[PDB]
Structure formats: C-alpha cells, structure tokens
Amino acid sequence: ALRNKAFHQLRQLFQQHTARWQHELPDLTKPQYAVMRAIADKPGIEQVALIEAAVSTKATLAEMLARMENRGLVRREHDAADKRRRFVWLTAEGEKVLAAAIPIGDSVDEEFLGRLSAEEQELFMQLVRKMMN
Amino acid sequence: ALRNKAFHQLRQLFQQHTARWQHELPDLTKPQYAVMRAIADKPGIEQVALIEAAVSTKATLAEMLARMENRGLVRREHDAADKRRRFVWLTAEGEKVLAAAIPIGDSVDEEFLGRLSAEEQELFMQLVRKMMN
C-alpha cells in the first residue's frame, strides 16, 4: 500500500497544506510568499539569490517575478554592466500584501504543526534536515 | 529566516526528492507512478477511487489518466449505466513500465531515507500522520 511509503505520505501532507494555503490565500502561493519574505529580509537582493527561497529553477523564478512585478508586488533594477542580472525590491503595495499574509500563512502552518508538541516539531525539523544534508 | 519554518523546509525536501525523481524517471511523475501502483494493486478500480493515490483533484486525475491512456499505459471501461464513471486497468506495456520503475523509485527514496535509521524513518512517518489526522 502507498500509505506505507514515507515520501508518498509526505506528498499527502504537502498537498493538504498547499490546499489549505490556496483556500486562505488564493492569490499568493507558497513559492511567491517565501520569495517575498526573502525580498523584505534583504531589499535589493540579487534575482538569482531568490532561487533558494523559491525552491525552483531560474525559469520558474523568472516567470514568477515577472508576474509578481506585473501585479505591482515587486520592482526590479538591472545591473549597468550585465542588464540580465537584476535586483529585486518590494513595492509599497507588496509590503501591504506580505504583512497581511504572514499571520494567515502562520495559522495555516499551525493547523498542522499544532497537532505536534514543541519537541515533536523541532524533531520533525531535524529529521527533514538530516534527509537533505 | 525561511530555514526556520517547518513547512518551507518540507518543500525543500519535497522538491529535492522530486528533482531526483524527474532525473531518474523523466517520463513517469510521482502522481503517475502512485496511480499505477494503485491500479496494479486493484485492477478494475473505479476512476474516482484513484484520487487518494494521485493526491489531486478530479480534473487533474482525469487529465493524468487521459495522457496515460494516450501513451498506452492504462486502459479504461465505462459503466453501462453512467458512462462517466470509469474503471481503470494497466495495459501490458503499463505493467512493464511499472515493474521497471519500482526499483528506480525505491532507490530515489533510499537516497533520502537512507540518511535516517530505521527508528528515525518510522518516527518521521508517525510525525507526518499526526499532522494530518
């Protein structure tokens, strides 16, 4: 049975959280939200540096930022030397969207993390880290 | 930092496993592979019943099975009463593709699960289950 595979059950949890995220924030996906968190944490960050926050490829991040910039969420400036390298900022409207979404995303995470104690949450984090490093 | 969010790090692990899965099996995604496992486990299963294995909506499963059936992987039969309700079987070619992919997917899972002991793997499974039930 697929219920006995750890990574199948992982996709069940990931899609349950994504479905709840899409219901509460239909206009801000998790990769879009995480990218905005990184821009607000480091204004003027290099566009390529947002790959880690996006957990995506260069093309997916380029398409994501182009749509975000078209929706008035982010603004970008090019390098005078290499006009392909870009620096990303949050627009004033983008900071309002991000500020309103942070408690919504936290409560969506709390719907699942709340079923775990503090020790179980930190232990879930350590298990996921060991599987990647 | 996003590295301190449990569900962001969960997406990092899920995309790392997906990227490795796409490199080893570029023509069989995880939702396609899991659906084929369910069909081989229950030949003639109802199409709607494959939603749990697909971890998707009805439209995503309908599009997935239509592409799979077009590629000669599955075959379908309709209900004489309600021709929209369908039963799914694996074609002879589909069983060859599934048999060859099972050890490939297992080794992809082992690339990450191998970093954990047996107790840590079962404990990762229990933590994910408690977050959903």
| Method of determination used here | X-ray
CB–CB contact B9 A41 (8 Å): no
For B5, residues 6+ apart whose C-beta sits below 8 A from its C-beta are: A109
Are B55 and B31 in contact, with CB atoms under 8 Å apart? yes
- Resolution value, angstrom units: 2.3
d(CA B106, CA B78): 33
**Architecture of the CATH domain A6-131:** Orthogonal Bundle (1.10)
Rounded to the nearest angstrom, the minimum Cα separation between B10 and chain A is 7
Chain A to chain B Cβ contacts (< 8 Å):
113
Nearest to A9 by CA among B33, B47, B131, B73: B131
d(CA B20, CA A107): 31
Rg (CA), chain B: 17
Are A125 and B5 in contact, with CB atoms under 8 Å apart? no
Whether residue B58 lies within 8 A of chain A, CB to CB, comes out as: no
Q: Quote the tokens at residue B39.
A: 């069909």
Q: What is the CB neighbour count within 10 angstroms for residue A73?
A: 23
Which DSSP string do the residues of A5-20 spell out, in sequence order?
Answer: -HHHHHHHHHHHHHHH
In chain B, where are the structural domains located?
A: 6-131
User: Nearest residue of B to residue A35 by CA position?
Assistant: B2
Q: How far is CA B28 from CA A99, B11, B18, B20, B70, in A?
A: 39, 20, 11, 12, 14
CB burial of residue B29 (10 Å; 0-12, 13-18, 19+): middle
Mutation for testing the B interface, residue in A10, A15, A23, A24 having most B CBs under 10 Å: A10
d(CA B56, CA A8): 13
For A132, residues 6+ apart whose C-beta sits below 8 A from its C-beta are: B12, B13, B16, B112
Are B106 and A7 in contact, with CB atoms under 8 Å apart? no
CB–CB contact B116 A131 (8 Å): yes
Are B24 and A14 in contact, with CB atoms under 8 Å apart? no
Q: How far is CA A59 from CA A42, B25, B41, in A?
A: 22, 21, 38
Rounded to the nearest angstrom, the minimum Cα separation between A81 and chain B is 31
For A32, residues 6+ apart whose C-beta sits below 8 A from its C-beta are: A64, A68
Are A111 and A19 in contact, with CB atoms under 8 Å apart? no
For A99, residues 6+ apart whose C-beta sits below 8 A from its C-beta are: none
Q: According to DSSP H, which parts of A1-133 are helical? A: 6-24, 30-41, 51-54, 58-70, 92-113, 118-130
Q: How far is CA B81 from CA A59, B73, B77, B78, in A?
A: 47, 26, 12, 9
d(CA A75, CA A94): 9
